[PDB]
């Protein structure tokens, strides 16, 4: 179970067999290649199909991978694994990680020279519901933008236990499919140039070798890649994708998205794999698939008569408002070089019989879209089609594979696929659609799924002319409310020329590419209506299904929302529903919210340009109170380095009283909130009551989309007012329904967002945003309003454009034009590892609410380096990167395996280098150690106060000091003592005394703690919330120690204690319990005997009868008879040895002598040898030389001896060189795993 892998050119993309650098003499790229062996000189054969892709890695739970990388390239490269655990020796990234230089070699590997080692623990592998093998990847992490854009990306396959099973190696196949865009003009090698959308690195259908056998099934480990946004809707001509366990028509992928999809190949032949996004640039993503041979009640028949035929279509049957400094006019009003609102288009139209002389029932609300075509699995639909147009059209369904002609099976001419065969203004065709099983749902997804048909003789301009209609596909009014999101591009519609004649003053005025006229016919439509012309009446408590399609120009995804409402997606209640082009989803919701609402787009610059419509519904134990206001602040998006402009923002904060004056300051548990509002947490069935007061210059609003208004005011439909004026104080109250909260199959606590909605886009960038947790059942309680079983954090990913933030004109504060220093890629408003507040206990679930908001660019691909988490929607799937889309607020949980300081990135390479990053600290709760305060390791000069009474100097505050005057003391009321630890440290507690003066008892009965990082940024330790601040209980007398603990441990280097109640006089001796940042201070078990006597062994051991000084007993502070180790003879060649059984990171050695009889023995000088095997040895050299370590000066006092820079080894020997009277050792070892 030790799998060894030996990973380590010119490429034109179409010419296969350039990977023959193995062995034929006929752009600069650096890729991953394999090797046979540990001697780095022998190339392997790599398959045709893998192309540029790095070696596929296969393993299992509980194994260990051992890669050896050797850099043989111009530039440096690292090896960064995704979705496994590693030791910091293996992270292949460099940043402010507080990491020894030995553990930073991985961070950058120079030409020549690195093994990595990854762990795959039990908690790392897939669950029962997951695919048999999770799809991950690995890359160089020295310059993401550069490294990816140059060819550094391979596949990572993490399967559950059971790879050594005899797979039928006729099937299987299972080809990783990297879908990587490469921007060859911004890779390492260069000096714009071009940007290649590829499949496995080949363009224009050229990928060789992807052949699969017929009546079997093929799995697909799918990896997207790319260094900007942009999405891809990936299809396979005659075929469906199965992902998680859902029938999906496209694959929804986007930079570093990872899937395992499987599909099933029923038709022999060759089929086009291709991305379907309108932007023809996207048109390198194209590959062929060949499928071959290898070795060894009662179903209805529905009849529909449908005609293509032309009509005048009105996008706005409700007059707008001539006022044209507000675009509205241009797209719809009539006049000069503007058409208007009546465009001639062609539709699908249902008729009643073969005569086509009388029309079936039209219906307002479904405008433009053809007749509703229902059909359960098994049925047949006879779509009798008659043309009646001018151009030759057609009708064909995207979704069903088996669509042949009726009666005959043979096609009229040289027609490859019926798709491009036209129908002739006056012909009839007879089609047989047969709905089979492999088109339908899959138990785990909803009853019906939403598809569509359209003409395909010229796909583009036919759909653009208006040939579209809905097709449901289900399992064994009626079917109603169909919502079609459709940008109709009238600049391609066949009837462009005819329209000009009828609707213009003079067809003379040509212009044709005048971009105002062109962009005046891009009606951003819902169904067929625009700028609020599609009004649709629903009732109250109507349980309604919604069938939703995205077919149009569009190009970019749509992020669709209903105001005030919450639909059911994947058997889970969500709030926005992201839809790729040519994609359709079914949602289901109950109309429980009276009011007038707006359906619309959220995508910024469709929505303004018309894509609206109105929803008009109308009929036909505790109370948890939060006090929250919108207040203005200053904000620098990150101070640390880089030339420091400050920006005016506006933010949500929590207050205590109705009298908004005491602001309930936060810290530790909520420092991270940043620009974000406070956590407002409720359980289910209790009530939420938010009193909201607008400070701020402008007016703002409190909207969530959980806000449920009651059935007041019966006269009509009502636009919900909202709109809090800059000083007014509106109050919202609403009960929380079981449907606003976690399903029994989700996590204990669901997250929902909340913000202003007086200008959706502009005033999020200004800063109004916060998390609204909805916890489950009886989990969240106490007087804390929180789970407390789990540490919870909220991370809001977005790219603030301070040019769009309202207060931007108020920031004339600079002095007297490109924006790229006014944009910040900022998690919660901090950029570049600047975000504070992320402290988490060793082993202890942590729940992360992740939100993105804003413009289309925000398709962030969030990675937790070295960790994995679990997402839940009806079942539980392991993942390593969640592909956060704007408006979606997912909830995932992880436990942190390994101690240290770890990075939270956005794997969008551009975003990362633009600052979108931070870190968190995971500490061991078991690393409490004295910071050297009593032991004098902290030299006197670092303690510091502010007044001294007299001779009672702060340099005396040292626990256990004795005599006379023996402490700090001050007669000032407001005083403080301040300790400079000399570097950032982790503090878990503080032990506190106070001395005696002649006959009085002096002590602090009540203090407070301040700490600081720089030395003038002190903050009060409001530990564990409690109130305005933590009042600590001091002592009761001289002698006793009071051991307060810091259970959100203090991260600081200056700590400062403020006495608030003393007896007679503030007077203090103290000790600081703590740990270094990397948690390397604890014993490795000498004192706890955790190292059984068999692991300790030495070169000799004096024995006679009455003594027996065997190594086993040489443990620090052991007492009694014969309490230490004595070599059978004294000489500087002897050594004592300890087999740790594992490699350890030894960072020091405490060391002791022994009292015995009367003659005192201790070791003045020693040296240290180390080994990985137990038969080879090396002395710990340093700065040149064989170190000689100082020794004890007495036979009772322990002395520490830090090892710098600390050695790694599993074998440790101590070589005493010079001693006193006799060699005698007791010791502890300091370090960690």
């Amino acid at each position, epitope marked *: 179970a030790i799998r060894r892998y030996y990973l380590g050119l010119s490429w034109d993309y179409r010419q296969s067999e350039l990977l023959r650098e193995l062995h034929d003499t006929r752009y600069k790229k650096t890729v991953f290649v394999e090797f046979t062996d540990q001697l780095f000189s022998v190339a392997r054969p790599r398959p045709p199909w893998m192309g540029l892709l790095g070696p596929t890695i296969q393993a299992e739970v509980y194994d260990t991978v051992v890669v050896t990388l050797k850099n043989m390239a111009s530039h440096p490269v690292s090896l960064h694994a995704v979705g496994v655990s590693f030791w910091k020796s293996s992270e292949g990234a460099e940043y402010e990680d507080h990491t020894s230089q030995r553990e930073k070699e991985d961070d950058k590997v120079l030409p020549g020279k690195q093994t990595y080692v990854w762990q795959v623990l039990k908690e790392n592998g897939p669950t029962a519901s997951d695919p048999p093998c999770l799809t991950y990847s690995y890359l160089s992490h020295v310059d993401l933008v550069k490294d990816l854009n140059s060819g550094l990306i391979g596949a990572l396959l993490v399967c559950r236990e059971g790879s050594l099973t005899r797979e039928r190696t006729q099937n299987l196949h299972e080809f990783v499919l990297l879908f990587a865009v490469f921007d060859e003009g911004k890779s390492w090698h260069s000096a714009a140039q071009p940007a290649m959308h590829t499949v496995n690195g080949y363009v224009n259908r050229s990928l060789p070798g992807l052949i699969g056998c017929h009546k079997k099934s093929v799995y697909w480990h799918v990896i997207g890649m790319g260094t900007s946004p942009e999405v891809h809707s990936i299809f396979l001509e005659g075929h469906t994708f199965l992902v998680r366990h859902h029938r999906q028509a496209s694959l929804e992928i986007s930079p570093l998205t990872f899937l395992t999809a499987q599909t099933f190949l029923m038709d022999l032949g060759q089929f086009l794999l291709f991305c379907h996004i309108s932007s023809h640039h996207h048109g390198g993503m194209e590959a062929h698939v060949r499928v071959e041979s290898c070795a060894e009640k009662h179903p209805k028949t529905w009849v529909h008569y449908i005609a293509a035929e032309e009509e005048d279509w009105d996008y706005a049957p409700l007059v707008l408002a001539p006022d044209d400094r507000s675009y509205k006019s241009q797209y719809l009003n009539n006049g000069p070089q503007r058409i208007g609102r009546k465009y001639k288009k062609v539709r699908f139209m249902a008729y009643t019989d073969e005569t086509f002389k009388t029309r079936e029932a039209i219906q307002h609300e479904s405008g433009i879209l053809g007749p509703l075509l229902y059909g359960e699995v098994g049925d047949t639909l006879l779509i009798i089609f008659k043309n009646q147009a001018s151009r030759p059209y057609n009708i064909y369904p995207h979704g069903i594979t088996d669509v042949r002609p009726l009666y005959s099976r043979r096609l009229p001419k040289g027609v490859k696929h019926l798709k491009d065969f036209p129908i002739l203004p006056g012909e009839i065709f007879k089609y047989k659609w047969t709905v089979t099983v492999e088109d339908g749902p899959t138990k785990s997804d909803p009853r019906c799924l939403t598809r569509y048909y359209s003409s395909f003789v010229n796909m583009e301009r036919d759909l653009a002319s208006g040939l579209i209609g809905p097709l449901l596909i289900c399992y064994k009014s009626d079917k109603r409310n169909v919502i079609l999101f459709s940008v109709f591009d009238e600049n391609r519609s066949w009837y462009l020329t005819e329209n000009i004649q009828r609707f213009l003053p003079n067809p003379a005025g040509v212009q044709l590419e005048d971009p105002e006229f062109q962009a005046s016919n891009i009606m951003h439509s819902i169904n067929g209506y625009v700028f609020d012309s599609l009004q649709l009446s629903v009732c109250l408590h109507e349980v309604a299904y919604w069938y939703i399609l995205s077919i149009g120009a569009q190009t970019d995804f749509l992020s669709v929302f209903f105001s005030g409402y919450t639909f059911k997606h994947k058997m889970v209640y969500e709030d926005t529903l992201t839809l790729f082009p040519f994609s359709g989803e079914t949602v289901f919701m109950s109309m429980e919210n009276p009011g007038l609402w707006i359906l619309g787009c959220h995508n910024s610059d469709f929505r303004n340009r018309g894509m609206t419509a109105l929803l008009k519904v109308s009929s036909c134990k505790r109370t948890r109170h939060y006090f929250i206001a919108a207040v203005e602040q200053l904000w620098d998006y990150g101070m640390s380095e880089s030339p420091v402009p400050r920006f005016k923002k506006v933010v949500f904060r929590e207050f205590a009283d109705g009298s908004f004056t005491q602001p309930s300051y936060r810290g530790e548990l909520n420092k991270h909130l940043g620009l974000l509002g406070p956590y407002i947490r409720a359980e289910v069935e209790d009530n939420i009551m938010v009193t909201f007061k607008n400070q701020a210059s402008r007016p703002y609003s409190f909207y969530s989309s959980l806000i449920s208004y009651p059935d007041d005011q019966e006269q009509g439909a009502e636009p919900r007012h909202n709109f809090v004026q800059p000083n007014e104080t509106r109050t919202y109250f609403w009960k929380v329904q079981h449907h606003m909260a976690p399903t029994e199959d989700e996590f204990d606590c669901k997250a929902w967002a909340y913000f202003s909605d007086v200008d959706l886009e502009k005033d999020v960038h200004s800063g109004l945003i916060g998390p609204l947790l909805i916890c489950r059942a009886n989990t969240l309680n106490a007087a804390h309003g929180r789970q407390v079983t789990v540490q919870e954090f909220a991370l809001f990913f977005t790219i603030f454009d301070e040019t769009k933030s309202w207060y931007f004109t108020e920031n004339v504060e600079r002095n007297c034009t490109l924006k790229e220093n006014y944009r910040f890629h900022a998690i919660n408003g901090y950029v570049m590892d600047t975000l504070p507040g992320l402290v988490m206990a060793q082993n202890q679930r942590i729940r992360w609410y992740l939100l993105s908001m804003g413009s289309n660019e925000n398709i962030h691909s969030i990675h937790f380096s070295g960790h994995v988490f679990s997402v839940r929607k009806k079942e539980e799937y392991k993942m390593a990167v969640y592909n956060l889309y704007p408006g979606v607020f997912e909830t995932v949980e992880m436990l942190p395996s390994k101690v240290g300081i770890w990075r939270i990135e956005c794997l969008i390479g551009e975003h990362l280098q633009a600052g979108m990053s931070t870190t968190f600290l995971v500490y061991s709760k078991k690393c409490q150690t004295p910071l050297g305060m009593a032991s004098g390791h902290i030299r006197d000069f670092q303690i510091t106060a502010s007044g001294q009474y007299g001779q009672w100097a702060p340099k005396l505050a040292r626990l256990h000091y004795s005599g006379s005057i023996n402490a700090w003391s001050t007669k000032e009321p407001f005083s403080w003592i301040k300790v400079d630890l000399l570097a950032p440290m982790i503090i878990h507690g503080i032990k506190t005394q106070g001395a005696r003066q002649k006959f009085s008892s002096l002590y602090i009965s009540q203090f407070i703690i301040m700490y600081s990082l720089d030395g003038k940024k002190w903050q009060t330790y409001r530990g564990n919330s409690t109130g305005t601040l933590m009042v600590f209980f001091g002592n009761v007398d001289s002698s006793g120690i009071k051991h307060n603990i810091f259970n959100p441990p203090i991260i600081a280097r200056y700590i400062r204690l403020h006495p608030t109640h003393y007896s007679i006089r503030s007077t203090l001796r103290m000790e600081l319990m703590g740990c270094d940042l990397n948690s390397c201070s604890m014993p490795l078990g000498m004192e706890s005997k955790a190292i059984s006597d068999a692991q300790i062994t030495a070169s000799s051991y004096f024995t006679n009868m009455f003594a027996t000084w065997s190594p086993s007993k040489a443990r620090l502070h052991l007492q009694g008879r014969s309490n230490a180790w004595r070599p059978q*003879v004294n000489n500087p060649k002897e050594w004592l040895q300890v087999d740790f059984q594992k490699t350890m990171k030894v960072t020091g050695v405490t060391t002791q002598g022994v009292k015995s009889l009367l003659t005192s023995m201790y070791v003045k000088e020693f040296l240290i040898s180390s080994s990985q095997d137990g038969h080879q040895w090396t002395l710990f050299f340093q700065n040149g030389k064989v170190k000689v370590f100082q020794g004890n000066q007495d036979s009772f006092t322990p002395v520490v001896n830090s090892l710098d820079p600390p050695l790694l080894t599993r074998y440790l020997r101590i070589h005493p060189q010079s001693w006193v009277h006799q060699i005698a050792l007791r010791m502890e070892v300091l370090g960690c795993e």
Partner: antibody, heavy 114, light 96 residues
């Protein structure tokens, strides 16, 4: 292949070990001055990787210990000679190994007269 | 550290005499070597009862507090490696 050496001279009374094939620093070296007719006594152990030395009561005033790392050589200096002998060796820093006095010195001539 | 009888010659392949006696208790840390006339010094016995590398397998015993054909002409000195300062031996002279 473990080998030793010593530069093979005299002077008047009253006047002021190379090895290859192993690790020069992480092994002790020992000097010896076998007096004529008697036997072999003891000088001091030099650790060429640090400088730790344990001299002998006799040559305490005449057994100084110097060396150089990036050369793999070790010398010995004595002041004021007396009117003469003929005769280094290697010991390990840990107990257990067999690299203890395995290879011996190459011998050197030394005389004190006028 | 002396030798006994420090002078008992022989020839080639019989029971001669070459035994070492220590001042104090050493326990294991004794050796025995050979001196060639031109200055060549080798090693054989070490750690009481243990064999060497480039030396044949014929020589070797120990007991608290004492311990121990071909080119047979040397002065066998023993070695004491139990505590500093170290010391060799007296010398057992032989001649053919």
């Amino acid at each position: 292949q473990v080998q030793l050496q010593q530069s093979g001279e005299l002077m008047k009374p009253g006047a002021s070990c190379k090895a290859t094939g192993y690790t020069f620093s992480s092994y002790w070296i020992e000097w010896v001055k076998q007096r004529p007719g008697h036997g072999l006594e003891w000088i001091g152990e030099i650790l060429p990787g640090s400088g730790s030395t344990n001299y002998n009561e006799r040559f305490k005033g005449k057994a100084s210990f110097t060396a150089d790392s990036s050369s793999n050589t070790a010398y010995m200096q004595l002041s004021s000679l007396t009117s003469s002998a003929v005769y280094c060796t290697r010991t390990s820093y840990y107990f257990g190994s067999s690299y203890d006095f395995d290879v011996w010195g190459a011998g050197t001539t030394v005389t004190v007269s006028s | 550290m002396t030798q006994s009888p420090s002078s008992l010659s022989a020839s080639l392949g019989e029971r001669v005499s070459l035994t070492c006696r220590a001042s104090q208790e050493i326990s294991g840390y004794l050796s025995w070597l050979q001196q060639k006339p031109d200055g060549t010094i080798k090693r054989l016995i070490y750690a009481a009862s243990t064999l060497d590398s480039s030396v044949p397998k014929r020589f070797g015993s120990r007991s608290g507090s004492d311990y121990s054909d071909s080119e047979d002409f040397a002065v066998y000195y023993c070695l004491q490696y139990a505590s500093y300062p170290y010391t060799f031996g007296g010398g057992t002279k032989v001649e053919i």
